[PDB]
Amino acid sequence: SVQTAATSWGTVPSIRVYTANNGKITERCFDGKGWYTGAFNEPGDNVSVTSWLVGSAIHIRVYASTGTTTTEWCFDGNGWTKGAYTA
Amino acid sequence: SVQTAATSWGTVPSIRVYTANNGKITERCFDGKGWYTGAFNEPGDNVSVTSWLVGSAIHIRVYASTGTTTTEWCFDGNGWTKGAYTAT
Amino acid sequence: SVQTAATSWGTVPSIRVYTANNGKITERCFDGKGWYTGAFNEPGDNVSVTSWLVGSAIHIRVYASTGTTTTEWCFDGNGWTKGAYTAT
Ligand SMILES: C[C@@H]1O[C@@H](O)[C@@H](O)[C@H](O)[C@@H]1O
Ligand SMILES: C[C@@H]1O[C@@H](O)[C@@H](O)[C@H](O)[C@@H]1O
Ligand SMILES: C[C@@H]1O[C@@H](O)[C@@H](O)[C@H](O)[C@@H]1O
Ligand SMILES: C[C@@H]1O[C@@H](O)[C@@H](O)[C@H](O)[C@@H]1O
Ligand SMILES: C[C@@H]1O[C@H](O)[C@@H](O)[C@H](O)[C@@H]1O
Ligand SMILES: C[C@@H]1O[C@H](O)[C@@H](O)[C@H](O)[C@@H]1O
């Protein structure tokens, strides 16, 4: 059974949904029209997400877990990079 | 055994908690007094949730998963309807 | 295999991550300069979280599930106390 996590910002709105399926996490996006595929693609059997705005600029943190190892992924306006989070 | 998801809005606050137990997702609600049962009741083994405020009016999106099938459910003031969401 | 839940607030920015591991939930904290361990430490196999501001002060509700039993934990400025939440 697949496992998901969701966040949203604004009032249009913008929505991001992350799905862990047979060890891989992918991203689906909504910005007021239809759903499309996002840039996020990394390993994980489990996922959680949060987001915040600084003025009108979006920041997303994805917590991806394989066994007992959790990796933080960071969106800050220019692709995804690894964050400093440890357990 | 059971899996939950939670969202909140305003300063009172209002809270909604969704629980996947025994093949069904059910909803519990708080608006400043006690907890009561909500209208949401649909099939699922896994659940996630997000929400946004339009003035004082809440909008809720619930993502219900069984196997490789994820169904989006939509609250916009007048009950729950299925959404256009599909996976990659 | 571990399960996590996350919440954030403000422009510090502030983040809280909860991890369920072998029936225990722990908390890691970010407030602008490195991660540290937080006060929350209670039983659970499954975890969800939500939070809201009153002025600039954070309030957090953590939903900790062991089997079919869900307990709500409450932060309102000074330590964690059990909440009134029960399931359908
Ligand atoms: C906010 C961003 O929106 C699109 O650019 C996606 O491709 C990214 O992964 C991210 O979700
Ligand atoms: C808000 C911060 O963004 C990056 O600096 C990450 O490396 C940190 O772990 C944190 O998520
Ligand atoms: C908002 C608070 O921040 C720190 O004091 C943590 O130790 C608490 O558990 C709580 O997360
Ligand atoms: C916002 C409220 O805070 C405390 O009163 C809890 O006992 C309730 O369950 C609710 O979470
Ligand atoms: C915001 C709405 O509150 C109502 O009382 C509930 O019955 C709906 O399901 C929804 O949560
Ligand atoms: C915000 C949008 O609401 C619509 O009713 C849904 O069908 C879309 O999938 C999306 O959630």
What secondary-structure arrangement, pairings included, does this model have?
Three copies of one chain form a homotrimer.
Chain A: E1 3-9, E2 14-21, E3 24-30, E4 35-43, E5 46-54, E6 57-66, E7 69-75, E8 80-82
Antiparallel strand pairs in A: 1-2, 2-3, 3-4, 5-6, 6-7, 7-8
Protein name (chains B, C): Fucose-binding lectin protein
GO molecular function (chains B, C): carbohydrate binding; metal ion binding
Keywords (chains B, C): Lectin, Metal-binding, Zinc
CATH topology assignment of chain A: Lipocalin
Helix content of chain A: under 10%
CATH classification class of chain A: Mainly Beta
Summarize the largest interface: chains and residue counts: A-B, 22 and 22 residues
End-to-end distance of chain A: 26 Å
Modified residues (N6,N6-dimethyllysine) (chains B, C): 24, 33, 69, 82
Keywords (chains B, C): Lectin, Metal-binding, Zinc
Binding site for Zn(2+) 1 (chains B, C): 45
InterPro entries (chains B, C): Fungal_lectin (IPR012475)
Task: Describe the protein.
3 copies of one chain form a homotrimer. Chain A is mainly beta. Chain A is built from no helices and 8 strands. Chain A has strands spanning 3-9, 14-21, 24-30, 35-43, 46-54, 57-66, 69-75, 80-82. In chain A, the strands form 2 sheets. A 4-stranded antiparallel beta sheet of chain A has the order 1-2-3-4, with no helix packed on it. In chain A, strand 3 (24-30) and strand 4 form a beta hairpin. The radius of gyration of chain A is 13 Å and the shape is globular. The first copy, chain A, starts with a strand and ends in a 5-residue tail after the last strand. The A-B interface holds A 1-11, 13, 15, 17, 19, 21, 26, 28, 30, 34-35, 37 and B 45-46, 48-54, 59, 61, 63, 65-68, 70, 84-88. The complex binds alpha-L-fucopyranose (FUC) (4 copies) and beta-L-fucopyranose (2 copies). The site of one alpha-L-fucopyranose has 8 residues of chain C, from strand 3 and strand 4.
